[PDB]
């Protein structure tokens, strides 16, 4: 997975934490 503050993409979800689909970066641990 990706660590937060990556690029990811939006429908996979693919971040350690979650994606989010605005910014497409990982999402904070909280």
Same mark, same amino acid.
């Given at each position: 997975? @990706?660590?937060?503050?990556? @690029? ?15 910014? @497409?970066?990982?999402? @904070?641990?909280?």
């Amino acid at each position: 997975c @990706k660590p937060p503050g990556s @690029k990811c993409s939006p429908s996979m979800r693919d971040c350690c934490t979650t994606c989010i689909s605005y910014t @497409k970066r990982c999402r @904070k641990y909280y």
